[PDB]
Design a protein around this ligand. Structure first.
Ligand SMILES: [Ca+2]
Ligand SMILES: [Ca+2]
Ligand SMILES: [Ca+2]
Ligand SMILES: [Ca+2]
Lengths: 291, 295, 303, 304
């Protein structure tokens, strides 16, 4: 599976990225960066940290837009990655960043790489702009896997509320039938008690140290809500990752008091909205990658 | 018992406030608000909603500081909802009315209360920002206060109040006598957590208070995966029902870790002049109290 | 003055481009295209016609976006004709010749222009989709642009296509908001639809739209005929005024008003410009020097 | 210029206050006190001494906090003497008179001043405890203040009380961080310790702190004696430089850089100021008009 990743690399992004790095059947052809959890510069820094920790700097990193499309301007720390110390990980080395804008690089990849899939872990600003400039190219992409949206209070949702116009563009331009959704609701339904589960609190190697220290601030009232990892889990392990799912046509509320929330109607040509995951397989995947 | 309450009235604060209102030997002399779970503006709204649902709007409400002393704000709408009180609908409660707010800052109002109300007690349900500012400005006034009852500190993973403003907690722990301090810790709240599919006392109807409790606890229960962790209610239970609420406690000298990887955590050391740190409550009496306030 | 032009070249766009072509102190560095008055395809053809009629076809033309950022296209009555330029015949103008079009998308071209050409100004004659996207992708580059001259909005609150919104900003209100909340309003001059109605002429009292003797005079006469025939000869020449201001600086402006503007992005007033007095908002021109303007409109048609 | 002064009136504070008292276009609307060089109680007495010696006891004095926000009190050698003012004898100055002190706490008084006095400016000569509490309680009121002039920090990272920290900001780094992240840094001018010993004078080649013949000369001469005795005769006039900058504006400033400043709140560099070029940050003064400065210091001591 050839996979592009769009990220606002904060903490759960980095672990999502590791889930893709760990599967040998996955080929990451590019990572685009967008502001969100942290500034665009911090996101590029943090993608670099994540790749350097895993030991595969083989993947081109593209910088995207710095702000949401229309809406004006944290939890993942000051640096967006749990305020970790580069000297404790050996990641105080120059960062790689390609010259092409993330929008142009994604268009070129969609135009030239066959059977390209995309994993969207962030507000959809880069994607929406790409769809605006070359919809024919982006429409060549085989499948969209998106973390975002909510049905558990919806006010925990970040990606689509952060740029509801970009989400609307995606949802009305790229075919929803070829779209799978890992929602914020799903991240809370499949959440774990960190007083009962230890898979984000190991040591022995660089990977475990990285996961343990990055997740510490996010672990919320001591719960692990693994939104972006679940999205990567679904993208990489397909139907085996999914227990329950429903087909829903989705749209953004772009005005009024519910601005940024989403509307969903049962529709068989709509998004595949995952409603429950295989948590046992999920944890096993998380543990295996930390070997 | 004259009681001052400091709160960032989200969901469990509101139920804690109701415990105080429901016991007729408690006189709430004022409620001060601090940002925490939600913005200060939402906390003021939520304190007003709680008092109007109970039917006793004669208690003065003071607004305090907007942010922690130095740490950034850490609002938690994924747990307590966008408004901090589970996004209830005022039109279901008749609370779509103007909010009361006194003109004085909560810091000066607390100082004045401590100077003028004898045997004043304080129940702290939030990051200790307002209290820490009052102790720096007028330690001599705040030290007149008879006893501190504090929800905070922890070990489980997710303590909020002292981690949210660890400098403020340290100011309290190093300025107000720990012997006159009783702690309802996050450990206690986790120890006394209930499963919502086995206990129904937050799922009743028939009157306004039952509807308030049921609807406000909906989002936070769902976030904790079907479990009720009644942190602030336990603190109010301990303050109101005294040694009757306490089954086991230890005297511990507490301090905050203000630097390094354990920033926001506490140290605890056995000490008979430290805080009274509650280890076990009478869970049976507690559930009884929770039900009776809804009658 | 180096100038980039973003246009949905219909009739009044074309006259505005000619106003810039006629002034020898103006260097048109590029012309980007966006749908508006007509489809993108037709705007490209029409910019080609305009340059060919003037006789300066060495200006690069770039195609931009096909649809507004978020809003649907909105079925509007094709006032500028089926082809967007009054349905002229290319055989009547000798413009039955190959078109020119650069390979680069207009957004990337605009970014590259703003990075490499010093003291670049931009004249915006159309919905701001291309400019908004350029500002989202590379705000640093577009913020290098010394000044924005923009035709759009309605300082009063009553425009053409809706009672609240002027056509360009109603067509893509999010794009207009993006420009107005991202590019400095103080460095922006607005030629509103209300300024266009204020400086409105009746074409049966002036003859500068009814000459022949050369190709430019025919081009103006034939293209403007539909607009003149719409509302009994009263022409609100918005884009030509915008160019007039952009080319002739303080001389186009005698009275103007500083208003910070923002878009209404919901409700019936979708696309309306809100104006609030603010001395570092947009320079919203409220009346022009009509004498110099008619003199300019005549001069470009001289042999 | 309406000016609020916050001080731990030790020796250089007092001279800084005299610089403000001496210029007729400066109106001191109030003086708040915080512990530092000495205890709060000594600070209040020392502000009283200064005002009595100058002969303008018309300015209200407010007592502020009793300790830093959260840090324990430093354990340092009292360079400014036991009373915080070089252990002078009140009999040498006629200052054995009642001390004035308003009833309102300095925090509430400052908030009230910021709410009611137009074009208010503040000169901060001490750990920023009073100011940070006022910003925590009522940021909207304190943000009405037109400009902050602050003695503290060391942008080059060379402190005094620690290798990394200047005394005011190391004594209460949280307070300093509070000011720096709440009051607009663009409206803040910094007179750093780096400015202080760049403009350091050796007192055996300069005499302007060693005159006699009137009460102000005796005061300055006697109070500065221990500070001079400290580092072989080198005077680093930090607080006077801050007041000089506050009172004489552009004429006081030779060179400056716009820098965003941050506090180190943990580890061995606790209290150090980080600095990064930023056009909306603090105006960090790099060099003062030393000639005008000495001139100013002499004129206020003139018999005339
Ligand atoms: Ca993410
Ligand atoms: Ca609380
Ligand atoms: Ca146009
Ligand atoms: Ca001082």
């Amino acid at each position: 599976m050839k996979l592009w990743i769009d990220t606002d690399c904060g903490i759960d992004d980095a672990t999502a990225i590791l889930i893709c790095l760990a599967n040998p059947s996955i080929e990451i052809v590019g990572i685009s960066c967008i502001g969100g959890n942290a500034s665009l510069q911090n996101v590029i820094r943090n993608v670099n940290r994540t790749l350097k920790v895993w030991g595969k700097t083989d993947i081109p990193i593209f910088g995207g837009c710095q702000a949401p499309l229309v809406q004006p301007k944290h939890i993942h720390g000051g640096d967006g990655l749990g305020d970790i110390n580069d000297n404790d990980f050996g990641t105080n080395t120059p960062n790689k960043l390609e010259k092409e804008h993330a929008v142009n690089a994604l268009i070129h990849a969609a135009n030239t790489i066959e059977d390209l899939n995309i994993l969207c872990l962030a507000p959809l600003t880069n994607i929406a702009i790409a769809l605006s400039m070359a919809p024919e190219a982006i429409l060549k992409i085989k499948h969209f896997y998106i973390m975002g949206g909510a049905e558990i209070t919806p006010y925990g949702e970040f990606n689509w509320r952060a740029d509801p116009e970009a989400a609307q563009i995606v949802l009305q331009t790229y075919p929803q039938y070829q779209t799978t959704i890992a929602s914020w609701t799903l991240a809370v339904f499949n959440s774990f008690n960190a007083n009962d589960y230890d898979f984000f609190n190991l040591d022995g190697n660089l990977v475990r140290r990285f996961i343990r220290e990055t997740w510490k601030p996010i672990i919320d009232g001591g719960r692990i809500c693994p939104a972006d990892p679940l999205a990567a889990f679904i993208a990489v392990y397909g139907d085996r990752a999914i227990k329950r799912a429903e087909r829903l046509h989705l749209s953004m509320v772009l005005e009024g008091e519910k601005l940024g929330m989403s509307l969903a109607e049962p529709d068989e040509k709509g998004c595949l909205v995952v409603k429950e995951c295989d948590a046992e397989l999920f944890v096993k995947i998380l543990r295996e990658l930390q070997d």
